[PDB]
């Protein structure tokens, strides 16, 4: 029972100084290993370098003059240093916990072994966009119902916004079934666009009071609106 | 690759069938049959024995495996036999008989260690041309045979490059699977064991209590500081350290690092040099280790 | 660099091989990968399978060298779609840093879903902003390939339509939303509009109207 | 050039056969079968005795 967290900005100007935090709850930092990874669309996930519990560091030779790792004693937390970001180190950023593996293949005493590391607990991991411009925060207008027995559809808009990713509950996540939170959208202007429906029973619909609760961190705004049929 | 190499993957170009063309060809080698032609350094290297001697290459169908071998003596001679068990080194031997022919008599050549030899009966033997002059070597024989096994992991492989006209080099394939080091292992128990019965016969000669320790080879380089010897036509040379690293007054086996060589200069031959051409597959050869060959270290002690 | 691809039938097993074959004695680590999910490894010493694995799942241990490290998926089903990566560690080969080059798996047979359409007008509180879209939201459809074609009264609009590429959801199904933007003015001028979105043969069309 | 070396046969020495007579040393005879319809084996009635062929 491991939990770790990722606690990131979401957005970083680049040539500035990239920062993370991973917290863990199962266990202390200094019994295992913390390694982050980072996933980006159309490349391959990259492992970039694990953390001892001491906290001496290896990292990857490609990263290697950019990244600074560090282990707090305190707090569980695995903080993540980069710098001279761009938009290519944009991408979904893990941090996963590292065991140490030994595979023996000869005699031990002239060496003939070598170490192999596997990360098994993974974080959720918290995305990261690089880019000049700036956060917006979004729009929210409620989507009316349509009005056979007795299914009924409503929901909420979320206008353009940036960067992702947005939250979106109902009823302060009281309301759980037949939730359909849609991926956003790119348009040509720079900002995502999603949508979030709701399916409710026709009786239901009079009266429930319905209201998407949404959240857009990077521009610091948390919203909720109510959901009423219109004439 | 690797970070923080015995063998080393070398490129050159050789000649081929026609005198005309040539051929670029690569080969493993081993660290100890090569030296650097620059040592400023460069890196471009030779074979060892360019230098000194020219080189040929042991034909691959003969055997270097020691058989039994009677020597005879002709009509109008005969050989006298000491059949006396406790017989040392020369001297009186009261029970002789006469043969035509001596036993089946292995011509295994080593170092160091002796292998295959016969096993003296009754108490172990030691024998020495003057035991009170340190220069003169000391034989040791058995009456208990050590088991010693000798192992070269590495699944070499043979590459036959024609070099001329009927002509065949025979190099070594780039290594199948792991990269391990040649080593041969000797039970502690045993040894300890017999290396004690060693101690005892040799009180009967330096006082019934003294101090007998043991080192390594001091002395010499290449052959004579190594177990030297041949197991399925690849050239070992071990340390012995592990072996004669004891001190002596009043399951757990040894292992011994074994390197390997190709180019050899046996019996101090000046002007000639052989090339063993590599063996394919893993080579695993178990041996008797029935005497010993020791000296002492004089000095004013 | 980019991935190569994998493609099984429905209950079919199936066999992953590994690129950059190993040289040596190899312990290899098999990542089961999600676009947008966190990796869960199957495999991490050749024939371990962490806590929670199911037994399907399988690969081959090296206890003889000139084997090659491959993973085997029993039964194949819709979840085991994915990309797989292969993390070799060799006794020839150094620190290996670099995962495989993805294999995306693909899973044929799997039974079509079609379209649920749900097209929504544009929010008053929109229209007071002086701007309209319309949403038209389309899940529980395999395979996830569809196209939209908006359209007026008759005419197309083809103009300011913007559509997210399909994407799986928890379902295993894909879900996929389109936008058209209008000015207020062309909403209120048009007697309905319509979406109409075309998955595989079939074509099914929502329409709304102004108030 | 592919299997094996060549040697140029010197240009003094003959390849034609001369009669040559093969003998056995001393205490050892060679017995010649003198039967004309003697076939490949069996009992040579006719025999003689020579010390070279
Ligand atoms: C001359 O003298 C020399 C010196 O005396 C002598 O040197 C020896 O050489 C031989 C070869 O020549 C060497 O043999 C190898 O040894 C390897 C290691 O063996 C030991 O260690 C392992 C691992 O121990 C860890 O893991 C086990 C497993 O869970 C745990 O239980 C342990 O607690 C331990 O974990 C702790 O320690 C780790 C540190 O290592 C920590 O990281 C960890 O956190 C923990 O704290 C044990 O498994 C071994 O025990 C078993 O095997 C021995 C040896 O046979 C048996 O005696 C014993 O009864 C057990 O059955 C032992 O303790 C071997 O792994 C190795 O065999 C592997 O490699 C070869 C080739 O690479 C493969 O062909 C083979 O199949 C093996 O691979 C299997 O395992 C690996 C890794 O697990 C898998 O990746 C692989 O897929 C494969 O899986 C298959 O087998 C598994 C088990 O075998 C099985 O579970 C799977 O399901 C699958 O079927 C090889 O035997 C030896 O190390 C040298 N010794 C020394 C001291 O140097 C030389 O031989 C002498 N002879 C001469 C000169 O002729
Ligand atoms: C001190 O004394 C110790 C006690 O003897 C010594 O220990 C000896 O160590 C040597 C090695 O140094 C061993 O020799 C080698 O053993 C190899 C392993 O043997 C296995 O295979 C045996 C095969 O079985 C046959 O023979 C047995 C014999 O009784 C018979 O019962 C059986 O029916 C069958 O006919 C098996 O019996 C064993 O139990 C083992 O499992 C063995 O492979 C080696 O043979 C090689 O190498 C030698 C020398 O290099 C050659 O003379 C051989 O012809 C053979 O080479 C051919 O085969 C190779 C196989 O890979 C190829 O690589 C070669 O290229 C070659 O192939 C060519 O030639 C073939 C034949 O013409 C062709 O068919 C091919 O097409 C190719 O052209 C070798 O014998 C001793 O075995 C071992 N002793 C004992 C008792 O085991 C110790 O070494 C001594 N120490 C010192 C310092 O001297
Ligand atoms: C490695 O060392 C071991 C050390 O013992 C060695 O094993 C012994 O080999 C000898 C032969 O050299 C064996 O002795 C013979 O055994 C046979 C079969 O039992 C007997 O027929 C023989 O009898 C006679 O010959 C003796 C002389 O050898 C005479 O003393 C006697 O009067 C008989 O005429 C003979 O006893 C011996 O049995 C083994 N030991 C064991 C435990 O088996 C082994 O041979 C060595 N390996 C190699 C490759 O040389
Ligand atoms: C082997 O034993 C013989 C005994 O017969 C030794 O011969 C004697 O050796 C001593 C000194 O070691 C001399 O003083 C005697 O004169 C020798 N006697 C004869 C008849 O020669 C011989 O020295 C022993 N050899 C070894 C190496 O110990
Ligand atoms: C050494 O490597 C050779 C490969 O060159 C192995 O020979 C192969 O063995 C497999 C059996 O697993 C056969 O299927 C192949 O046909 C063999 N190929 C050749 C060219 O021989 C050999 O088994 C290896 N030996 C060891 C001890 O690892
Ligand atoms: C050298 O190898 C031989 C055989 O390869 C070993 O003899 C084996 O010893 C074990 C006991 O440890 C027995 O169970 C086996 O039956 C023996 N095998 C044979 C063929 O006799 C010997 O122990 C090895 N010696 C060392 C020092 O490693
Ligand atoms: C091999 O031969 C080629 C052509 O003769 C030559 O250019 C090259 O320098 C040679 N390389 C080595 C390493 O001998
Ligand atoms: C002998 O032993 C010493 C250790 O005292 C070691 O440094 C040296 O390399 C050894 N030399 C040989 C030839 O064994
Ligand atoms: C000799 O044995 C000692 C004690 O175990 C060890 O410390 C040392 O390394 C050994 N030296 C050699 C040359 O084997």
């Known amino acids: 029972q491991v939990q770790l967290q990722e606690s990131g900005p979401g957005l970083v100007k680049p040539s500035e100084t990239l920062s993370l935090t991973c917290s863990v709850s199962?266990?202390?930092?200094?019994?295992?290993?913390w390694s982050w990874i980072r996933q980006s669309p159309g490349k391959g996930l990259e492992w970039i370098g694990y953390?001892?519990?001491?906290?001496?560091?290896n990292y990857n030779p490609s990263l290697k003059s950019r990244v600074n790792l560090s282990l707090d004693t305190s707090k569980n937390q695995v903080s993540l240093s980069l710098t001279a970001v761009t938009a290519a180190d944009s991408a979904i950023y893990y941090c996963?916990?590292?065991?140490?593996?030994?595979?023996?293949?000869?005699?031990?005493?002239?060496?003939?072994?070598?170490?192999?590391?596997?990360?098994?607990?993974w974080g959720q991991g918290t995305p990261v966009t690089v880019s000049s411009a700036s956060t917006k925060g979004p729009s929210v207008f409620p989507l009316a119902p349509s009005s056979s027995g007795g299914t009924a559809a409503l929901g909420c808009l979320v206008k353009d916004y940036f960067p992702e990713p947005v939250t979106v509950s109902w009823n302060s996540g009281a309301l759980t079934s037949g939730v359909h939170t849609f991926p956003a959208v790119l348009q040509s202007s720079g900002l995502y666009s999603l949508s979030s429906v709701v399916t409710v029973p026709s009786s239901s619909l009079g009266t429930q009071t319905y209201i998407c609760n949404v959240n857009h961190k990077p521009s610091n705004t948390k919203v909720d609106k109510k959901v009423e049929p219109k004439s | 690759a690797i970070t923080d190499g015995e063998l080393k993957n070398c490129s050159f170009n050789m000649t081929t069938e026609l005198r005309d063309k040539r051929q670029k060809v690569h080969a493993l080698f081993y660290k100890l049959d090569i030296v650097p032609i620059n040592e400023n350094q460069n890196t471009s290297y030779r074979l060892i024995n360019c230098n000194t001697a020219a080189i040929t290459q042991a034909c691959p169908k003969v055997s270097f495996e020691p058989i039994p071998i009677h020597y005879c003596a002709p009509a109008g001679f005969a050989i006298l036999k000491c059949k006396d068990k406790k017989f040392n080194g020369t001297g009186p031997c009261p029970s002789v008989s006469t043969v035509q022919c001596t036993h089946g008599i292995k011509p295994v050549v080593s170092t160091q260690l002796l292998l295959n030899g016969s096993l003296a009966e009754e108490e172990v033997m030691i024998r020495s041309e003057d035991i009170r002059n340190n220069a003169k070597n000391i034989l040791v024989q058995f009456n208990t045979p050590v088991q010693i096994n000798c192992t070269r992991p590495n699944n070499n492989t043979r590459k036959s490059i024609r070099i001329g006209p009927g002509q065949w080099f025979y190099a070594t394939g780039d290594i199948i699977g792991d990269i391990r080091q040649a080593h041969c292992n000797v039970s502690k128990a045993t040894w300890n064991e017999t290396l004690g019965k060693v101690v005892k016969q040799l009180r009967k000669h330096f006082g019934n209590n003294t101090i007998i320790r043991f080192a390594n080879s001091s002395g010499g380089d290449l052959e004579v500081t190594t177990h030297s010897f041949n197991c399925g036509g690849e050239f070992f040379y071990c340390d012995t350290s592990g072996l004669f690293n004891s001190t002596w007054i009043s399951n757990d086996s040894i292992t011994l690092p074994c390197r390997i060589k190709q180019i050899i200069n046996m019996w101090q031959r000046i002007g000639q040099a052989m090339y063993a051409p590599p063996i394919q597959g893993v080579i695993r050869c178990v041996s008797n280790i029935t005497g010993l060959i020791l000296t002492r270290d004089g000095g004013s002690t | 660099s980019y991935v190569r691809p994998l493609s099984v039938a429905l209950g079919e097993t199936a066999s992953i091989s590994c690129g950059r074959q190993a040289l040596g004695s190899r312990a290899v680590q098999w990542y089961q990968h999600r676009p947008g999910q966190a990796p869960i490894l199957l495999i991490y010493n050749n024939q371990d399978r962490p806590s929670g694995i199911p037994e399907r799942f399988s690969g081959t241990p090296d206890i003889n060298f000139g084997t090659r490290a491959t993973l085997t998926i029993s039964g194949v089903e819709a979840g085991d779609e994915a990309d797989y990566y292969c993390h070799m560690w060799d006794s020839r080969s150094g620190f290996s840093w670099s995962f495989g080059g993805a294999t995306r798996l693909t899973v044929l047979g799997q039974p079509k879903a079609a379209p649920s359409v749900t097209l929504f007008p544009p929010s008053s509180e929109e229209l007071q902003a002086n701007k309209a879209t319309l949403v038209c939201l389309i899940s529980d459809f395999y395979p996830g390939a569809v196209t939209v074609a908006w359209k007026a009264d008759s005419s197309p609009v083809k103009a300011g339509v913007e559509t997210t590429t399909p994407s799986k959801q928890s379902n295993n199904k894909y879900a996929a939303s389109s936008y058209l933007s209008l000015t207020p003015e062309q909403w209120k001028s048009h007697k309905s509009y319509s979406c109409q979105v075309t998955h595989e043969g079939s074509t099914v069309e929502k329409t709304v109207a102004p108030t | 050039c592919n299997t094996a070396a060549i040697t140029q046969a010197c240009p003094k020495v003959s390849f034609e056969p001369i009669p040559i007579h093969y003998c056995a040393p001393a205490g050892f005879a060679i017995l010649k079968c003198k039967d004309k319809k003697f076939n490949g084996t069996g009992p040579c009635p006719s025999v003689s005795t020579v010390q070279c062929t």
């Open positions: 996963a916990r590292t065991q140490h593996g030994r595979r023996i293949y000869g005699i031990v005493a002239f060496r003939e072994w070598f170490t192999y590391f596997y990360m098994d607990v």
């Open positions: 199962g266990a202390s930092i200094s019994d295992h290993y």
């Open positions: 953390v001892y519990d001491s906290g001496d560091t």
